[PDB]
RNA sequence: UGGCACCUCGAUGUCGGCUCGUCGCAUCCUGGGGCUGUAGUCGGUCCCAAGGGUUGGGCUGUUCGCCCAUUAAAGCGGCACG
RNA sequence: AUAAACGCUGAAAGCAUCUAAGCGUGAAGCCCCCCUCAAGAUGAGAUUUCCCAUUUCUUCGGAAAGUAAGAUCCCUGAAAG
């Protein structure tokens, strides 16, 4: 799962580690193996995810 | 239970020229390596090969750090007796600019068959010029 | 100290298109390929040399770039002169339309010739000149002439030079 | 350089002008016919192919006489390739004669050596015997196969096998005389091989 | 020429050089030649 | 030459020679050089170099050693003192 | 193309310097030249020539059954074993 939402998160200038941070950072629960299955199958919605941890590094 | 599983076949395969002048012997192999095994892909799977074709020209002007052109050497041994021979990095370079690029990446891939497998997907070429514009390759940039 | 205030007095128009010093002259024409990375500014009489950093390489680099835009425009409008001479009983020296016989002592002759640019006469049979525009190929032929036979310490006889102080030492 | 191809017949001796007596090979080399040129711009490299003997249309089938038809010649039984050769002369159906050669030329001669069958250590490998008295039991046997430390025993360690059938190039052969009527070579000296067999006759390269 | 691991001076005209990373030293008289 | 006693006593055969070799370089010969209290022919010492080569006998079980006669030379060591 | 070594030009460091940039020589040694094996080199290469596009079945991947070029079983043998 790891290695798999680190090649979804690369697609929208970001880390997986960036995108770990700001997830927590803003309050998003979701665990890796439904993270990774958004990227896979739903990856429209991962991409809303992606934006809501971008915001909270940046404030 | 519930996690996808790629199928062989399944995930389409592209092709890719990459151009290897005034790049380090090592900062390129590393990359390409991971084209080849797919892990810039979210449709991953480790029994499965998922990667990407990868075309290298301009392979004579890779680039080699400090005195490597000279201090390193490439060791061979042919099982007889006192049968090692030795080549240097720069000498290798000049003559056989290929077998320098397939021995620096084939030991960044995995060592069992299916790794055996993604190095048959590497065409490495010393000029500027290929041979594949059938497939219609496209140029990747490095990162 | 100083690696600076070049002259170019007539006789010479430096065209370098960054690397290429082209310097003309009465006596020829020489170029070459300096690294593109010190300043170099072509003017009526001098080319100013200078450096970016104030570093190691720089210095160096400095030094060695003047000195030979120097030798240059010295030599291809008045040239270099390399001048030798011969020790020895039987120690012929002669030239023979373009090459070179030495007879220093050894079971055949001695073959030498100038490369272009080079110009190689013998006034006397016992003496050699070698004559260019050139300091790097002017010196480096007078060398090889030289290494036929070195003079030895003990008779000093062989090719030597006239400013060379040849330490002879005593055999027996 | 030249190059022919011939079947050796025997050994004999002749007698020089001085009166000396030398050991010569005889050869003969009719029928030699160029069939194909071989070039950069269609191989890769530069190469003539000769055909020695021709044989009965029974013999051959329908591939090689298809082959043989661009020359406009009989089916051949030996074919072979030159190289290092000027393709400039060599036109394709000519006939190539002993005449190529003269008295006095240097040759290499290039063959098959004779069979030997099964073959032991001193014999294939000239090797030294054990004792034939003085209590021993040791006579024509290989010797130590090695050391103990590696576990095993290295490569070419030499033992006993199939001996001859091999092919040697003799180098720096004269020859004595050309006969062009009876299409003979006389060599001086031995070349490899058994009688009736192929003998390859080039200049020599050195 | 002495190959030594105490490669220093002997008289007043010695010179101690570096050619090619390796310590030596030059002078006129040829029995002072000395590379580390 | 020794110190220890870690594997082996429900068995790890121990000297010399024979047959067959292979590796290291701290080089015996041959190859290339610097210094010399190197006139020449010979030498001394140090640096690079492992490609090939490196004898036949007398005494002794002998390795070792001495001797006879040669040779460009008759190297030193590891491989369960192969 | 080099090892030890010997040099040219040349600054750092107005001189000096075989060295930093740039050049030239330089070993029985390295890579070639010489002899042999070698496309299972699964990366399975290349050239010349020969045979051609049959008939029954299958729901499709496909199968069987007579052949062409070619080879073999069987027999006489040695230059081979
Ligand atoms: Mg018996
Ligand atoms: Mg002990
Ligand atoms: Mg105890
Ligand atoms: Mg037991
Ligand atoms: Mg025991
Ligand atoms: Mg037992
Ligand atoms: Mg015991
Ligand atoms: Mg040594
Ligand atoms: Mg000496
Ligand atoms: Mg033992
Ligand atoms: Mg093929
Ligand atoms: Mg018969
Ligand atoms: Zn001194």
């Known amino acids: 799962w790891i290695a798999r939402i680190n090649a979804a998160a690369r697609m929208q200038d970001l880390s997986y580690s960036k995108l770990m941070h700001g997830l927590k950072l803003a309050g998003i629960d979701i665990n890796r193996k439904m993270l990774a299955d958004l990227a896979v199958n739903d990856i429209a919605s991962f991409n809303t995810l992606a934006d809501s941890a971008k915001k909270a590094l940046a404030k | 239970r519930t996690t996808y599983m790629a199928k062989p076949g399944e995930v389409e395969r592209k092709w890719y020229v990459i151009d290897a002048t005034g790049v380090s012997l090592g900062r390129l192999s590393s990359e390409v390596a991971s084209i080849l095994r797919g892990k810039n892909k979210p449709q991953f799977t480790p029994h499965i090969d998922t990667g990407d074709f990868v075309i290298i020209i301009n392979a004579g002007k890779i680039g080699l750090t400090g005195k490597k052109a000279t201090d390193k050497i490439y060791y061979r041994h042919s099982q007889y007796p006192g049968g090692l021979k030795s080549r240097t990095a720069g000498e290798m370079r000049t003559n056989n600019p290929e077998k320098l690029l397939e021995l620096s990446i084939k030991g960044m891939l995995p060592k069992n068959s299916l790794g055996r497998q993604l190095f048959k997907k590497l065409h490495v070429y010393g000029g500027s010029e290929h041979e594949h514009a059938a497939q219609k390759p496209e140029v990747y940039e490095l990162r | 100290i100083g690696k600076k205030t070049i002259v170019i007095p007539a006789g010479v128009t430096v065209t370098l298109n960054g690397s290429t010093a082209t310097v003309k002259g009465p006596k020829g024409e020489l170029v070459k390929e300096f690294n593109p990375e010190i300043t170099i500014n072509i003017e009526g009489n001098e080319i100013n040399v200078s450096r970016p950093t104030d570093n190691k390489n720089h210095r160096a680099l400095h030094g060695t770039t003047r000195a030979i835009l120097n030798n240059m425009v010295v030599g291809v409008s008045e040239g270099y002169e390399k001048k030798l001479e011969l020790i020895g009983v039987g120690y012929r020296a002669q030239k023979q339309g373009d090459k070179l016989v030495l007879n220093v002592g050894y079971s055949h002759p001695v073959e030498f010739v100038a490369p272009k640019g080079v110009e190689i006469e013998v006034p006397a049979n016992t003496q050699v000149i070698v004559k260019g525009y050139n300091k790097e190929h002017v010196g480096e032929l007078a060398a090889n002439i030289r290494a036929v036979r070195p003079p030895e310490p003990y008779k000093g006889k062989g090719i030597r030079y006239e400013g060379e102080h040849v330490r002879r030492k005593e055999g027996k | 350089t030249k190059g022919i191809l011939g079947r050796k017949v025997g050994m004999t001796q002749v007698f020089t002008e001085n009166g000396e007596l030398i050991p010569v090979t005889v050869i003969e080399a009719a029928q030699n016919v160029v069939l194909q040129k071989k070039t950069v711009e269609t191989d890769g490299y530069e190469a003539v192919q000769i055909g020695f003997e021709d044989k009965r249309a029974k013999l051959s089938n329908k591939p090689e006489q298809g082959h043989v038809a661009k020359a406009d010649t009989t089916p051949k039984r030996f074919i072979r390739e030159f190289r290092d050769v000027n393709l400039d002369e060599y036109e394709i159906g000519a006939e190539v004669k002993v005449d190529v050669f003269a008295e006095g030329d240097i040759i290499d001669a290039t063959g098959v050596s004779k069979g030997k069958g099964f073959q032991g250590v001193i014999k294939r490998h000239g090797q030294s015997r054990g004792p034939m008295a003085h209590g021993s039991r040791y006579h024509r046997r290989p010797g130590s196969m090695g050391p103990v430390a590696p576990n095993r025993v290295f490569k070419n360690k030499l033992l006993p096998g199939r001996m001859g059938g091999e092919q040697i190039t003799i180098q720096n052969l004269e020859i004595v005389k050309v006969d062009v009527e009876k299409n003979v070579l006389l060599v001086k000296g031995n070349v490899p091989g058994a009688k009736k067999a192929l003998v390859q006759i080039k200049t020599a390269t050195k | ?36």
């Open chain 5, 1 to 36: 020429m002495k190959v030594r691991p105490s490669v220093k001076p002997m008289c007043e005209k010695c010179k101690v050089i570096r050619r090619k990373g390796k310590v030596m030293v030059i002078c006129e008289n040829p029995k002072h030649k000395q590379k580390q």
